[PDB]
Design a protein around this nucleic acid. Structure first.
Ligand code: CL
Ligand code: CL
Ligand code: CL
Ligand code: CL
Ligand code: K
Ligand code: MG
Ligand code: MG
Ligand code: MG
Ligand code: MG
Ligand code: MG
Ligand code: MG
Ligand code: MG
Ligand code: MG
Ligand code: MG
Ligand code: MG
Ligand code: MG
Ligand code: MG
Ligand code: MG
Ligand code: MG
Ligand code: MG
Ligand code: MG
Ligand code: MG
Ligand code: NA
Ligand code: NA
Ligand code: NA
Ligand code: NA
Ligand code: NA
Ligand code: NA
Ligand code: NA
Ligand code: NA
Ligand code: SR
Ligand code: SR
Ligand code: SR
Ligand code: SR
Ligand code: SR
Ligand code: SR
Ligand code: SR
Ligand code: SR
Ligand code: SR
Ligand code: SR
Ligand code: SR
Ligand code: SR
Ligand code: SR
Ligand code: SR
Ligand code: SR
Lengths: 92, 194, 237, 56
RNA sequence: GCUUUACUGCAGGCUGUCGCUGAGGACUCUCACUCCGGGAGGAGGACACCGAUAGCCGGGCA
RNA sequence: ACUCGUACGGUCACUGAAUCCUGCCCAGUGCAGGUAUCUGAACACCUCGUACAAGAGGACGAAGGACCUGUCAACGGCGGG
RNA sequence: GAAACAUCUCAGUAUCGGGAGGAACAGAAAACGCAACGUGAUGUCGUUAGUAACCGCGAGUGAACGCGAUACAGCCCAAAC
């Protein structure tokens, strides 16, 4: 589906309507320093490693919308509940 | 002023530098052709020996013992084993080589008791340790105020029971506080979780 | 599964061993200090149980009696020599340096003084090709050109008993008798004729190997069977 | 030939005999080892914890 | 019990790297180390072996 | 252990006396060889980061793989129209 | 056991090797950390507590400091000279 790159909508920060910019959430890079990373190093030894021996599952036929709504004035962002969309293209 | 002993000590802080380096490269050649346990007239490290309780006296013996380097020499499982227990390569023994050395020495001298031991280097495939042993039956020692404690019946085979300094160290008894919950008063009394 | 036959072999049990106690002599080149001065007389010719070929009994000047790996044409009474300045005649042993090129040699040493390693079976021989101050090149019975230390001792002539392979065993009994004199388990049951549990090629409702026969060099014992690291197979192409 | 009765008739070999050390007829005269006390195998007397229930 | 391109692992083989290990991207050398030689001595040589780790193969085995 | 053995050997497999013979196929799988380029771990090295460290990236790149070739008395195949 | 099962659990259990005593082991702080102007070798008993902590964060696993008691004990070398 088509979607406007910018449009007027409620800004939860300003508490008033403002022009927001829609952006697809880019994955942040991992540090490898979180607790789970330490547990993987610790709990991995001879033989099977339990959860650390599993390999990530498949995919759902269609993913939900993963967007960031950025307020034009205050410059802050907010998230919303996404919706199933095969393709999401921005207009402008 | 400095003791002559302090110089032997300082030399051994870096067995790969200076005269000691040359010395080791020379001795090890002779050590590699010697046996498993070799009695020697004088300690290679006087400062260490004396520091550990050694004395130039009757009933005090020293022997150099060589043990193989590396992890456990383990035989792979011959019956069902869960993946955790199927290992062979990465398994290491719980006693350190110095402790193995002490025991091999004590067995060579059934009548003597292990007083202490120290490292004297290693090549690419083995380590050497010199063990100081004591004759608990010689009156020269039965009358020595500093060593006659080893003559007590309860000190019999002290090495096989881990009463040696290296033994106690390896048993995780160094710390008197945090971390020694499962080690003191004994590994066995603590369910073997040390 | 169970360990395959190739694995039982390595255990060195009676069934797999050679009847050493029935073997005669470890035919090695006699040791000489230097100067070459050493000769002996062929006292007899005997059968060697370990090699199915003749062997010469030789008595030396110093009184030493030893069996020797006999080349062809050696008989009782003949005088054999061993040393740097030995005569270039069949039966004599001298370093590859003193041996003239183009001459057939047998029982060649791999490392000077080892007593002989190459070309020792019936009828075979190595060809001495090139000389040098550093290396003597020899062509072993397999056809391989072997660069060797010119100080490596060797005997002149082809090993006795040549042509043994020309006559067929004809019947199992004959094989049986030969096999009984070697360190080998015989007869041979085909892997493909066994149960899956006994060999990688075992199993199936009909006899045929499971997977292809060419096995990687890296294969572990118990699996390394069939055509070991074959660079090719068949006859065509 | 049956592994039963017919194969029993060849059994005229002596193996286990009275042991010089323990008195039990378990000294294997071919192996020269007592299956009961370990005489011929060890200076120490043969004994195992599995010879009784774990709680005893 | 058996099989395999089932899941997960473990031996084993190959390979890099660190240690043993030294002198003057390819090379020379000898002194550790290895082998041959009764020996004198010869070949080999900082490699190989061995200890450690990493990648690959791996129903040989669990 | 083989081995008091050394390629006319001995190991590993297949076929199964003699006689007449044993075609075609290397695409897949196996094995083996080669390989410009691509891919390929760890140590060491470089950048960023941290008064250090965790960590992120880079450079180099072994066996292996891609790719190329050899091979069916290797596993096997030898049809529809 | 986890209602399968691989980490986990059964369990450092069963069993195995070595060795001492009448008891063993431990033990006079490179301790503790109710953070203090505080405690003062070590075992053990009660408690702290199924608490903290661990864990396909599943099933399960699981201390310590302290406190109340028991009994109390403190010393010897190496080196300097
Ligand atoms: Cl999206
Ligand atoms: Cl002792
Ligand atoms: Cl044959
Ligand atoms: Cl307190
Ligand atoms: K289990
Ligand atoms: Mg206790
Ligand atoms: Mg011979
Ligand atoms: Mg033939
Ligand atoms: Mg036989
Ligand atoms: Mg057959
Ligand atoms: Mg059958
Ligand atoms: Mg059947
Ligand atoms: Mg099989
Ligand atoms: Mg058939
Ligand atoms: Mg067939
Ligand atoms: Mg040798
Ligand atoms: Mg299986
Ligand atoms: Mg048939
Ligand atoms: Mg269950
Ligand atoms: Mg569950
Ligand atoms: Mg537990
Ligand atoms: Mg605490
Ligand atoms: Na852990
Ligand atoms: Na002793
Ligand atoms: Na522990
Ligand atoms: Na079954
Ligand atoms: Na093909
Ligand atoms: Na269940
Ligand atoms: Na089950
Ligand atoms: Na777990
Ligand atoms: Sr761990
Ligand atoms: Sr693992
Ligand atoms: Sr799907
Ligand atoms: Sr004793
Ligand atoms: Sr020989
Ligand atoms: Sr010899
Ligand atoms: Sr089959
Ligand atoms: Sr053909
Ligand atoms: Sr029968
Ligand atoms: Sr009988
Ligand atoms: Sr015995
Ligand atoms: Sr027992
Ligand atoms: Sr035929
Ligand atoms: Sr092919
Ligand atoms: Sr007190």
């Amino acid at each position: 589906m088509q979607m406007p790159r910018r449009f007027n909508t409620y800004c939860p920060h300003c508490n008033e309507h403002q022009e927001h910019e829609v952006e697809k959430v880019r994955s942040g890079r991992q540090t490898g320093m979180k607790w789970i990373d330490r547990q993987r190093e610790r709990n991995s030894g001879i033989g099977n490693d339990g959860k650390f021996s599993k390999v990530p599952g498949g995919d759902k036929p269609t993913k939900k919308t993963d967007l960031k709504y950025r307020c034009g004035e205050c410059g802050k962002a907010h998230l919303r509940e996404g919706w199933r969309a095969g393709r999401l293209e921005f207009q402008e | 002023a400095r003791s002559a002993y302090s110089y032997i000590r300082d030399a051994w802080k870096n067995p790969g530098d200076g005269q000691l380096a040359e010395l080791q490269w020379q001795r090890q050649q002779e050590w590699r052709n010697e046996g498993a346990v070799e009695r020697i007239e004088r300690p290679t490290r006087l400062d260490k020996a004396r520091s550990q309780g050694y004395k130039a006296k009757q009933g005090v013996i020293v022997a150099r013992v060589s043990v193989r380097k590396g992890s456990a020499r383990k035989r792979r499982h011959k019956a069902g084993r869960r993946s955790k227990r199927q290992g062979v390569t990465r398994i290491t023994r719980r006693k350190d080589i110095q402790r193995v050395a002490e025991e091999r020495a004590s067995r060579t001298f059934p009548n003597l008791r292990v007083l202490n031991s120290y490292s004297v280097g290693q090549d690419g495939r083995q380590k050497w340790h010199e063990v100081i042993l004591i004759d608990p039956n010689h009156p020269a020692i039965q009358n020595d105020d500093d060593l006659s404690w080893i003559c007590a019946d309860d000190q019999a085979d002290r090495v096989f029971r881990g009463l040696t300094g290296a033994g106690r160290r390896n048993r995780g008894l160094s710390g008197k506080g945090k971390g020694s919950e499962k080690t003191r008063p004994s590994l066995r009394s603590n369910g073997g979780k040390g | 599964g169970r360990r395959i036959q190739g694995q039982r072999r390595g255990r060195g049990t009676s069934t797999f061993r050679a009847p050493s106690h029935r073997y005669k002599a470890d035919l090695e080149h006699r040791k000489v200090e230097d100067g070459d001065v050493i000769a002996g007389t062929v006292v007899d010719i005997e059968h060697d149980p370990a090699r199915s070929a003749p062997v010469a009994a030789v008595e030396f000047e110093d009184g030493d009696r030893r069996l020797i790996l006999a080349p062809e044409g050696v008989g009782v009474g003949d005088e054999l020599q061993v040393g740097v300045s030995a005569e270039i005649a069949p039966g004599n042993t001298l370093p590859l340096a003193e041996i003239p090129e183009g001459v057939p040699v047998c029982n060649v040493e791999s490392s000077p003084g080892d007593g002989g390693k190459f070309a020792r079976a019936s009828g075979v021989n190595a060809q001495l090709l090139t000389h040098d101050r550093n290396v003597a090149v020899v062509k072993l019975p397999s056809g391989e050109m072997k660069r060797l230390d010119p100080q490596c001792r060797a005997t002149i002539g082809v090993v006795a008993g040549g042509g043994r392979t020309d006559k067929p065993f004809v019947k199992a009994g004959n094989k049986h008798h030969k096999m009984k004199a070697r360190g080998t388990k015989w007869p041979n049951v085909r892997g493909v004729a066994m149960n899956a549990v006994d060999h990688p090629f075992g199993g199936g409702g009909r006899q045929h190997p499971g997977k292809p026969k060419s096995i990687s060099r890296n294969a572990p014992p118990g699996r390394k069977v069939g055509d070991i690291a074959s660079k090719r197979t068949g006859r065509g192409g | 030939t049956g592994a039963g009765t017919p194969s029993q008739g060849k059994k005229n070999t002596t193996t286990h005999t009275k042991c010089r050390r323990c008195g039990e007829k378990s000294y294997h005269t071919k192996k020269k080892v007592c299956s009961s006390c370990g005489f011929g195998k060890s200076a120490k007397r043969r004994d195992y914890e599995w010879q009784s229930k774990a709680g005893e």
